[PDB]
């Protein structure tokens, strides 16, 4: 060691926020050897990287130009305008060009050691790429924008240099449990529950004899199961319950990670029930040691198919992943197993058919994944990979080979997926495998990609008892190889946000019920901010949600606090980049009080839900805001700019405890509009957003909201907020929105008319992915929320999504949601109180 090098690990803990160094909650090597593993990926990927690439991370896609969007471009002419301190001349250029062959065309239009960058934002159009495949280029072309550069060096690789660096049957002892304090209630009766546990496939489970509820019960008894110890899956869990009813579980694995069968003396700290989810799979013991239940435990230990029969397994094959697969069902899969490999959508079932407590069967089992002809042929299908890394799946070849298909993956579609795929982490049995490898490997290559994994692993790491520690295993190996300006940055990163959050706090404590903001409020804000400007805060930080934007000093008269009961700030901000071509603000809300790991996860699948009807050509408009979860109930919000409330939109002349009216919307618009062209620009973005924001909502089942839920921005886009957070009506289309469309009652208009054909495309358009959000919704909530229904939750989205129905029988449902709103009207709006 050197000291240094503990100094450096005194920062890496800083930006980790957990100590990866100390071993006070264990009771095995994995974790230190999961260090030590991390160290030849990290190092590999390290090497192979394209340093100036790397110093410039192109965001680019491979992904075709939309149509809609291909009738946004002149004659193949597409105008750039590059900067140069106090100049700037236009040249026009072809979408199919490169950034290689247009600063030549910039020199010639009137030394190569320049490079084409965004302005204001630190974003490049560099490398062997038609420029019409960068996302910016993209950006601006959709948002109708002008695209703005300026012309100088390439950043210094040397900048981000890195650092150097036997047949007997399986049985446990139960010799007792231990509490320090009971008083829950008086008392009851309790006994532990020993499960042996695959894919939360139960194998064998076997319990002790009833006891009174004391402080300390022993037993002590010997729990003998079915299973023989050759038999016991890698991947197995020990899954021990105490039950009175469910109160307090605890995992630990059988065989460790040097696949040797766990042996001896345990004292294992438990976790606690508190009001199907993947906190229950944790190898983790609970590292409170004063407060926590404990248990004590010793360890001592050729054909061709009939016609009919090819139909019920196509018939299986097609079905959802929500679909139950009866034992006939998993016989069937099994029996022809070699069929059931030509397609590549049975494999998730197939595995499911397979019994992993017998030696012989998952022996059987790997002899056939040799057998990967047809899946390694297979094109990458996302959603039918997806399944293979969820909670039904322990084995590490089957989610071997889900990773393997991730490779494919260009970094463009990794973002799509990474907080999922990131959440996969707690599925995977043991703290390295291929998925944490893949993770690190994706985020050290694209710098873009290594940002977003620092604020998904930290946000867990934060607020995740249950994985803290795997996390800030994989978050530290992402650290040390990342480039040390990546790290410069981080620190500050988390720095700025250490502070706000203390202001967010301090004046969250300084703040009743009582829906006023007072002077002494709005002072000690301010000073604070000031007090804080001024102290203390960076010169310049880049903004989580947004690594494009850096910003520096606090527009203190901007910023204020949200009226409402968490009291959120409104921070808004000084950009650091004198070339942004406006002096527009950069706006932070920061807040305590919410779960913001809903919010982000919710905001994927919309993004994800973007994406889908881009394959279909299709932009329903959402606005997936920024947004990062930092610690327990704490994050930020981006603020969307030129933004209202309807609720605040319906408060006017219309006063306060009286509403609402059905026009006002209308005239808010054009209140807002300089043209009556633009107008109409904005009531057809109007009908565009409201359908876009109503076909997700129904899905992911979060439509029925109240209205200062709800914002439209000033050039008519509409979207939800705060996902927070959650008579009932299936999404909010209210009176307001009929009027604009133009249907007062209820008859039908052109743009209400447009409204239906948009809604039922986009539906329909989610329908042709049901199984990839069938798998992300399902991971959302397991991942992601707290009292939960592996039936009837989950069964929602299917349902939702109308599974099983043709195009008809679906675009009626659609429909008749619409109108169901329709009513109805304001009845829930109204309904508020
Ligand atoms: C009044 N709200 C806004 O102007 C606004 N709000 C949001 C937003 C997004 C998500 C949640 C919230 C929120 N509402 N109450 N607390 N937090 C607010 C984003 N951009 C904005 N411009």
Redesign the pocket.
Known sequence: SSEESQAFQRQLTALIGYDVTDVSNVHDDELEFTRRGLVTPRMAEVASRDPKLYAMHPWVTSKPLPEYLWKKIANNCIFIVIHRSTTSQTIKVSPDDTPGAILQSFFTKMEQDFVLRVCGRDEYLVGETPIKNFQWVRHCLKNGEEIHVVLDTPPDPALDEVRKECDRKFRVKIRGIDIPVLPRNTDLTVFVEANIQHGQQVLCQRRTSPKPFTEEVLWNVWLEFSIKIKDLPKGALLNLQIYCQLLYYVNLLLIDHRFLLRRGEYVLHMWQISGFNADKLTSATNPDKENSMSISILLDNRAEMPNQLRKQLEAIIATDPLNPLTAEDKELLWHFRYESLKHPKAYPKLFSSVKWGQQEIVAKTYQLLARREVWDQSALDVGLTMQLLDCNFSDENVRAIAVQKLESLEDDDVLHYLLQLVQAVKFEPYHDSALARFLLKRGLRNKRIGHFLFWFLRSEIAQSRHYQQRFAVILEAYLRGCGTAMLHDFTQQVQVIEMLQKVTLDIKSLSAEKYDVSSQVISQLKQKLENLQNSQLPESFRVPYDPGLKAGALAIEKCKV?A?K?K?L?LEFKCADPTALSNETI?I?F?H??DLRQ?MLILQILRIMESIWETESLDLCLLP?G?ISTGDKIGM?????D???IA?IQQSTVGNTGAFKDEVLNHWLKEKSPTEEKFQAAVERFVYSCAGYCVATFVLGIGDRHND?I?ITETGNLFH??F?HIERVPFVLTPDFLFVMGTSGKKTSPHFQKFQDICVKAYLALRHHTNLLIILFSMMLMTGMPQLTSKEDIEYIRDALTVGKNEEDAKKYFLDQIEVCRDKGWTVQFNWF
Do not use: L, Q
């Not at 919000?637 to 700019?641: A, G, L, M, Q």
């Open positions: 949200m409402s968490k959120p409104w706006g809300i807040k009080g919410d919010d805001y947004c919000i981006e603020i969307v700019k933004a209202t409330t605040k839920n914002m907020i705060d927070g």
